[model samples]
Structures are given as structure tokens and as C-alpha cells.
Target: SPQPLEQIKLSESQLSGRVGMIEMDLASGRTLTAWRADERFPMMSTFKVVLCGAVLARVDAGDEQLERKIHYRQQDLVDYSPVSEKHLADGMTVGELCAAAITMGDNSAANLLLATVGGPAGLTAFLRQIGDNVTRLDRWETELNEALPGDARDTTTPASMAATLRKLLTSQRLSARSQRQLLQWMVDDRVAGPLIRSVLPAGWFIADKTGAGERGARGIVALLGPNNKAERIVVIYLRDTPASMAERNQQIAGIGAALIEHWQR
Candidate 1:
């Protein structure tokens, strides 16, 4: 049997940063949350999920198609990307771009998709439509690297992100086809695979997106068990950690291990 929310134990050592988390069990409507779940954290690349949502919404509305191709110029290139950096072609389809963004955490692909949705304003409008007003897409990938003296970077509360994931699963905010595709891309994610996939029990399926930055922000929003069996959504946002990359990633893996242990007990 699953334990009550408060019975699930996590230690300060398990979370080495400003942290927020929410876990929801769809089978019983039970929820567990931790410190500052409602407070904003710089979501870093996880904001790309919203960018992907904005584009897919347009696809469902007949405003865009996945097959539509986008040409890339020299200016589209950005550092810290893998697949997009190797693309010698001048262009790729929207579907390909989204795949790269979610699966490989490719910055160029993310920026292109962001532009497809009309940039930050477009993402904000889509969020408003979905009733997730707490999260904001205030800048593009290029601007995200540069720190502003007094500005809110791309941000989202853990609760807000979890709600969005729930809506994606249970609401018409996105079409069924779009949801499946997006989830598939996330399941194929190779960038943050070790953080969550490495710790999940055998046979469990997790469709998730991960984000990180040089400033020590780490986050992941995941949907577990898609076929109505042990279905749940887990959201974790960590920021302002002094830990090294390896340590932070170990912390994320530890969190995943703890959740799996609690639910499977």
C-alpha cells in the first residue's frame, strides 16, 4: 500500500539545493508535496516543455503542421547542444526540431521551436489559456544565458508544472495525438536519462523532460505509468545548489529512488 504524504521521508542530504516537489497518484487522487512547491524557481531548459506545448496547440488548431520545415541560419546555432550542432542540413521539419529539443536537449532546436510559437509572448498566451498563470516564459534561450540585473528568468513553480503535466494527460489542452507524440519524445530523452530512468523500477514507464544550467538549476517533470496503471506525475525543481554536476545528478537519482521505494512498498 502507498504511504500517506507526510509519511514519505526525504532528508536534507537528499536535496542539496532550494527544492520543490509534488507527487500525485492518479489511482487514488492522493498527493505529496515538499518545501516551496508553490514558489518560483528558475526552470532553466525545462521551460522548453512549454515552448513545445505552444507549438503543438497550434498544430491542433490547424495553424501548423509537424511536417512543416524550418530553415536554419548561422545565427540559430548555440552552444551546449548535441544533435542540432551536428545537423549539416540547412533545415529540418517542425517534428524533427521538437524531437531534438526534448530528446537531446538541443538548444538550437529549442530556440527554433520557441520562435515558431511567436517567442515568449506566444508561450505566455498559451499558458494563460491553459490556466497555468504562475509559470512564465520571459526569455529565449540566447537571453537565458546572460544574467539580467533585475529580471525574472524563465521560471515555474513545482506545483504549476505538475498541474500542466496533469492537464496534458487529462484535459484537451492538447490533442490526443499531440500528447502521445510529446510523451514519446520525452520517453526517448537521452540527456537526463540517468537522473530518473536509472533509478525507476523495472517495467515502469516515465515520460519526462529535464533542464539544467551553469548556474546550478536542475529540474524534471515526469509522467509515470501512462496506461492507467500506477499513474502519477512527479515534478522536481532544484536551484541555487553549490554541489557539482555529479553530486546534483546523484541527488536527483536519489530522489527518484526514494519515490520508487515509497510507492512500491
Candidate 2:
């Protein structure tokens, strides 16, 4: 088989788009593969993961409680709010919102948690505090997904995102329980769970968040491993193509297939 980079480039050619990807060893912080790793792509729902990381930081600092219930109304609802719309009557706990936002890619659920952590600016600050300077959130949902060409708002580099995820999951910045909870949230991800799992060979484990935007932009940041161990982090983003969503998903799956087939080579 060709090298992993060749494999990824082949997938990019198949999609007629630019592909940015990074695969890193979770324990050693070694980047095994990188292509356009520093270029920007819209964050889309993938921002929800960092949004929740900030929330966990607040919880670790004793400033927020996961059980705290937040109330909202129909006016607060936005497009694609699957989990939050259902909670209009009783509201949902912070923990539930995190789960819905991360696992389900629930829009209203994410906006609510975005507010909890002080919105876009606040989350950017959290990234800075955690030593990620390239990832930034400049707008809230729907608007953030507008993937206009060359617009830097609500964009991040694959390298920056991968490093930040590494810090949040492995560093001491978050409490032990907080770190475990964050990983659990990713593990429970509904958005890319079945799809990513289906692309890999059996016995591989994956926890991930997925996002899509205008201009054929799409991304997935994941923790993947063979034999059910979470050993590596992979961030892949696609942009600047008019491919169908079906083609996009298949391109991502192809990249993942290459990574799985060429792991540690």
C-alpha cells in the first residue's frame, strides 16, 4: 500500500477538495501525518466540543455545576435543535446539554452551553488559556456555518484543534473526573459514531465530533485506536469543493480507512 499521506491525497482527489488532516499519538504527542494542518476551516459543530471543554473547566473550578438546570423558550430555539426543543417544558441539566450538544450536535443545546461559557469570545479565551492560539469562534451557530471563502471567522487549524483536544483530554488543566467526563461525552457521540465505526475494521474504537458547513466544508476530530484502546487523535477537515454530502462523508471515511490500514507504518 502507498504511504498514509498518499492515501489521504488520493481521497482528496476523489472529493475534488482540499483536505487538511493530522494524526497524532495521544500519549507521545507525535504527529504521524499532517497535510495543510495549519490552514483554516470553519469550525461548525466541532466547536461544541471545545465549548464543552470550557464548561468542564468552569465545573472544575467550582464555578458551574453539571446538574444546574437551564430554562429556555421557543424564542431561544434555533434551526436543528433536536434535544433542546424537546426540553422546553422541563429544561435540561448542564450535563444533559453537554451530551446533546456533543453527542447529537444539537444546535440550541450548543448555543446554550456557548452562553454558559460566555459565548464565542469566551470560548476563544479558553482556547488561549489552554495554549491553542489558532482556533477561534467568531460567531454563533448557523452563522458560524456560513463557510464563505477566506472568511476567518469561526475557523480553526487541524493542528491547533488536535493539540487543544490533546490538552483537554490528557493535561492536568481539567480535573480527573472532568477529563474523564469529556472523553465520555466524545465516546457517546451520536453524530459520527455509527458512521465512523462502520468505516473501520472490527475491534477499533473511535470517539468523535463531526461538523459541516457551506461551500462543501466538513470536518471530524476523533480519538481512534485499534483493539479498543484510545491511542491516537486524528483531525481531518475538507473545504472548497462542491461535492455532495454523500461524497464528503465517503471521502472522510476513505481517509479513516487509510489511517486504520496504515497505522504505525
TM-score of 1: 0.86
Across 1-265, the per-residue lDDT of candidate 2 in tens digits comes to: 4677987788778878889999999887999899999999888888888999999999999999999999999999889998899989999999999999999989999999999888999999999999998999989877999999999999999999999999999987999999999999999998779866776688899999999999899999899999899999999999988999998987788777777777875
Candidate 2, residue 224: the lDDT equals 92
Report, for every candidate in turn, its global Cα lDDT versus the true structure.
0.72, 0.90
TM-score of each: 0.86, 0.97
Model 2 ranges off by over 4 Å: none
lDDT of 1 by residue, 165-193 (tens): 67765576799999777777777878766
Choose the strongest candidate by lDDT: 2
Error of 2 at 18 (Å): 1.1
Query: Which parts of model 1 are misplaced by more than 4 Å?
Result: 1-16, 26-30, 88-90, 145-151, 225-230
10 residues in a row with least lDDT, candidate 2: 191-200
